[PDB]
Design a protein around this ligand. Sequence first.
Ligand SMILES: *[C@@H]1O[C@H](CO)[C@@H](O)[C@H](O)[C@H]1NC(C)=O
Length: 246
Amino acid sequence: DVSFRLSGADPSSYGMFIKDLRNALPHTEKVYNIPLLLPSVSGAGRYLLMHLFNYDGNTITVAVDVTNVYIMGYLALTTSYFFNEPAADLASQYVFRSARRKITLPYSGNYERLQIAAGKPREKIPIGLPALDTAISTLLHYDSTAAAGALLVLIQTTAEAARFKYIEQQIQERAYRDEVPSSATISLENSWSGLSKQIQLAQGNNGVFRTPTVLVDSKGNRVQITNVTSNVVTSNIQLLLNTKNI
Ligand SMILES: *[C@@H]1O[C@H](CO)[C@@H](O)[C@H](O)[C@H]1NC(C)=O
């Protein structure tokens, strides 16, 4: 398990949480010095539990698939909540079984469905540690529309930050003031699968991507990533989605 407390949180403690989160994900090899997530894991070992505490010390436990860092569901007091998708229903066989009741959320966990439920794209949803505190509080009591927005915040401030050092840093900058994600942040989130694939394809292609990945950089300028010498590969990405899951 890993834990994060919003009470007394600062960029340092958040950095420690994201480090813990990354380190809780198993891998047997690195590709270009980046941990390669496993093709599969059987049983309960597939799911990492993240214990998150809001500023007041109330808590949810979030279940995360360790092969892809996808959030499957969460536990709030005695109620479990899972995304309406087969991977989450499968997860519900292994985690939070002691919950008094299980609610299946009225959407899957992918960005497009969540944004539809929340009534806005995540370009317009502020993120940061204060937003995470709010998200935790929102998820404590069921409200599916509110929860969609909270989950967009949660996914980006946990999973996406674990995947990309740039995103971790963006959240650290928003430790005491929320701000909508940078266009670069959105670009990286959208490109994680693609990048993971091309980095793995580069292993037998002399470090060269079979297909270039287009990203937006820190200054809003759109760029092409063509090989493993790019800063996105050497410095930024921290976890690779196994190509067997792409
Ligand atoms: C690879 O990427 C580097 C750094 O971005 C770039 O300058 C160069 O043109 C590319 N080289 C090859 C062989 O693709």
